Amino acid sequence: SALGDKAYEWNDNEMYLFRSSVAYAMRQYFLKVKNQMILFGEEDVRVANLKPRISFNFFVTAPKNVSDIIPRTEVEKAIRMSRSRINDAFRLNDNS
Amino acid sequence: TIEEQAKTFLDKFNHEAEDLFYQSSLASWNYNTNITEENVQNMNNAGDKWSAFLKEQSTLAQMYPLQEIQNLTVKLQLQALQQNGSSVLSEDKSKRLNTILNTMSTIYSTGKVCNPDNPQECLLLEPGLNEIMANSLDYNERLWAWESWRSEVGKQLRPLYEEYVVLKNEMARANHYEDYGDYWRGDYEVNGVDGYDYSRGQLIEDVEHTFEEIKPLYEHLHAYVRAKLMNAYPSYISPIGCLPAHLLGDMWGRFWTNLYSLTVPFGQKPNIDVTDAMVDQAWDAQRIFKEAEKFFVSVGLPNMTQGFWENSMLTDPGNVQKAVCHPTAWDLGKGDFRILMCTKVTMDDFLTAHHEMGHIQYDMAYAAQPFLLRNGANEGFHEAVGEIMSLSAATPKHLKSIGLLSPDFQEDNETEINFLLKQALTIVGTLPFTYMLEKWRWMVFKGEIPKDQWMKKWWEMKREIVGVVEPVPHDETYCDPASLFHVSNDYSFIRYYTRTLYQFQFQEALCQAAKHEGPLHKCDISNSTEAGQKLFNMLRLGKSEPWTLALENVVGAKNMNVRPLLNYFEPLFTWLKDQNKNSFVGWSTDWSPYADQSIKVRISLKSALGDKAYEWNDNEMYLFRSSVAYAMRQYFLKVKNQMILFGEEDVRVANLKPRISFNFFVTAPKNVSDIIPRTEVEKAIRMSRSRINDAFRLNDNS
Amino acid sequence: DCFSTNILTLINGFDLPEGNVTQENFVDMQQRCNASDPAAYAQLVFQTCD
Ligand SMILES: *[C@@H]1O[C@H](CO)[C@@H](O[C@@H]2O[C@H](CO)[C@@H](O)[C@H](O)[C@H]2NC(C)=O)[C@H](O)[C@H]1NC(C)=O
Ligand SMILES: *[C@@H]1O[C@H](CO)[C@@H](O[C@@H]2O[C@H](CO)[C@@H](O)[C@H](O)[C@H]2NC(C)=O)[C@H](O)[C@H]1NC(C)=O
Ligand SMILES: *[C@@H]1O[C@H](CO)[C@@H](O[C@@H]2O[C@H](CO)[C@@H](O)[C@H](O)[C@H]2NC(C)=O)[C@H](O)[C@H]1NC(C)=O
Ligand SMILES: *[C@@H]1O[C@H](CO)[C@@H](O[C@@H]2O[C@H](CO)[C@@H](O)[C@H](O)[C@H]2NC(C)=O)[C@H](O)[C@H]1NC(C)=O
Ligand SMILES: *[C@@H]1O[C@H](CO)[C@@H](O[C@@H]2O[C@H](CO)[C@@H](O)[C@H](O)[C@H]2NC(C)=O)[C@H](O)[C@H]1NC(C)=O
Ligand SMILES: *[C@@H]1O[C@H](CO)[C@@H](O[C@@H]2O[C@H](CO)[C@@H](O)[C@H](O)[C@H]2NC(C)=O)[C@H](O)[C@H]1NC(C)=O
Ligand SMILES: *[C@@H]1O[C@H](CO)[C@@H](O[C@@H]2O[C@H](CO)[C@@H](O)[C@H](O)[C@H]2NC(C)=O)[C@H](O)[C@H]1NC(C)=O
Ligand SMILES: *[C@@H]1O[C@H](CO)[C@@H](O[C@@H]2O[C@H](CO)[C@@H](O)[C@H](O)[C@H]2NC(C)=O)[C@H](O)[C@H]1NC(C)=O
After folding, report:
1. Crossing angle of the two packed helices B3-33 and B38-59, in degrees rounded to 10
2. Which residues are glycosylated (chain A)?
3. Does residue B382 carry a catalytic annotation?
């Protein structure tokens, strides 16, 4: 819908880029609000239920602690804060 | 008181201190001779009691102001008993500091790294990794060991070091000192002598003055070693650049001696070696000590008492019992001196026996002095005095005169050159490292180096003082200097500089007094009563007078001097100047081992965005590294048809500037030594430049 | 345009922040960079447009 023609193919490298973008967003939110330097990585974004529609679930954990799961509220806040950067990193616009 | 009550206090303190300390020495000696569990607690309680006695004696010394004291000896003893130490620090802060020191020591002692292709084979430092660094001739293996040890140790030791420096600085400031560095430098401080004073701040100036004179010989030696390292690692070392840090035969580059097998001047002709003559004559591990005692007697110095010879543990048992046999001299006191060592039949054991014999002679020379004054003049005198005996005894002339090394031997100057170069690799190769490390620590304590720039400054010094370049860039998360044993265990490092200067000053003075033909490297002082008298004139003083006065009694100088060292190494300097006609003597602080394959990036945010432009920080650097990794993954998948998992930690970044310009390069995922060539990175960036640009809202010019 | 190019060449040569050397403060910064270290300012070629 966003690209029509000239659209790229989605593979595991695009999943890596998406995980990196989400980690960057969480880092930015934690730095700019809570004033904490937390080193979120792309291995803290756990992804499940991948479908050919390109739909999946994800959640975020603490950098070195699998038991600690960041609640959905601040994940929503971070996505709201950095949605524009997330979108233009992939050439999609808020509907795609 | 006053004088009478102070003398009574000192006498009654010493009357107990002698026997407490004596029993503690028996406990330690009995532990060391045989490892017995029942004596461990005996050592522990005795040491705790001795520490409590010292603490209480310190507490009962506060009611003695220092302005009413006329005698100098009691003044020095009261000052040596007056320092608070860690007592003034708060209880919670003291507990925190002790915990952090213990954690630091434990991390250094029991940290291990692991192979990237066999994670079930992991090596400690002193076994394995040290041998990898000391014996391997492979560039890749040495680089792997270097980088892998530095990574984990720095990452674990950084925050602990920051908290430790903060706490130590606060404690030192609480004790009327500028910082911790001033407290460390205060060992050489002497006052109230009206003619021999030495300020704390003069030490820095003296050290810089000495290094400025030592620089040229080190420059020639560095150029010679760099020239000789080409044949071992071709296409890896620049003819005008520095030396890579991992090729120096040691983990940290403290000593260069392990390069002697690669840099020998004449390898076909060996140096002197008669260790087989001692084997042929069937010399047990008892004649060497008697020979050392005879040599010491010859100069007129006092001899060994029968009490020492009564207690002899030097013969290694070799049974199932395992005990440490590190050569040491024990000074339990009240006429009780011993040496504990494992004695074999070898040259190095012979020289170590002479070293320990000199240690014992110096230690018992000042026995008549009071207990609190039973020590060397400063921290550097003891080792220098112990070492110059072995240095004088190692000459082949003494070997010929002692019975070995039959006179039908015509010495060649090639052997002398080999010996001088081997000595240089140990003596001159370590002075820049010591100077640089102590300088960095002093300016870190003093606050000159911001906590943000530590790593930066450190490596800058290594490119300009030592002439050594790192093989991979290190960001601010590392603590490379903390990898040393001395820094992470809170030890001082300037004693190794001052001792190296003092030993050669003493050797030159002794040779000049003995009226040697020429003291180049073959000087010996055997059978010279005046030399022994001159040495004894300084040995027996102890700490009763400033070390400057002790130095004047031998060399007639009030400060450290470098001329005797240059005089000692003059023949090698002449040979090196002859051998470096074609080489470019010196180095340049711009060449880097990774600079050929790097790519420069310059970013102009204001031009592309104007207003509303975002601020650039480390999160943007993380995003840039991730984008570059994605680009490399895509290129390798879509052209070479290989599934390689590049990460954001394989993009190494250097030279960050406020213009937002930096260099970067890419390595293989788990292999650090493997660097992707610049052409492939160019192709990948060409392929994915559109996505790289649009991820940051910049357009091909910004 | 000529003045902007003259600013840009110095900015690139000396790796200064973009937005520090403007039209009003070009000469003082230009001579300060030269006074910092010769033999690196020398290779910079400036235009004398007026
Ligand atoms: C990982 O995260 C959990 C919390 O999700 C941490 O668990 C805490 O552990 C301390 C123990 O002193 C408890 O007092 C806390 O109540 C625990 N938090 C809970 C139950 O929510 C755990 O310590 C973390 N592991 C780390 C940092 O290594
Ligand atoms: C530790 O080693 C020594 C010698 O092997 C032994 O104990 C010593 O034995 C001698 C007798 O020759 C005594 O003079 C010493 O007093 C003993 N040392 C002591 C009691 O500390 C024995 O093998 C071990 N000593 C132990 C277990 O105490
Ligand atoms: C140490 O204190 C004493 C004063 O009690 C002084 O030294 C004494 O000087 C006389 C000489 O007439 C000697 O007979 C004494 O044996 C000395 N007593 C000592 C050394 O304890 C002087 O004030 C100081 N002596 C020093 C620093 O050598
Ligand atoms: C060691 O620490 C104690 C602090 O208890 C210092 O004692 C202080 O001495 C000063 C100077 O006379 C007095 O003004 C304080 O009242 C003392 N504090 C006390 C007794 O609690 C002691 O001087 C320190 N030792 C030094 C600096 O050498
Ligand atoms: C210092 O000790 C040495 C021992 O190495 C003495 O040399 C021998 O000492 C014994 C005494 O037990 C004498 O019987 C020998 O005549 C001495 N000479 C030899 C070759 O064995 C030496 O005399 C002592 N030096 C002194 C007292 O000035
Ligand atoms: C070692 O000794 C030989 C001869 O003793 C040296 O050869 C002479 O050295 C002098 C001065 O260096 C030169 O002027 C002569 O031309 C040399 N050849 C002769 C006299 O035939 C040799 O240079 C020395 N080599 C080292 C490394 O010391
Ligand atoms: C890691 O580093 C290098 C790659 O640069 C690999 O070494 C290459 O392969 C063998 C070693 O067995 C040697 O010929 C050279 O060291 C290198 N040859 C080249 C670059 O042509 C090394 O094997 C790699 N180790 C791995 C992947 O486990
Ligand atoms: C700035 O660069 C010029 C380039 O030469 C130098 O200026 C010298 O000093 C004064 C400046 O007023 C002139 O009279 C000289 O002709 C200049 N050239 C010389 C001495 O060779 C110098 O590098 C720098 N000058 C200043 C003021 O910063």
Report:
1. 160
2. 65
3. no
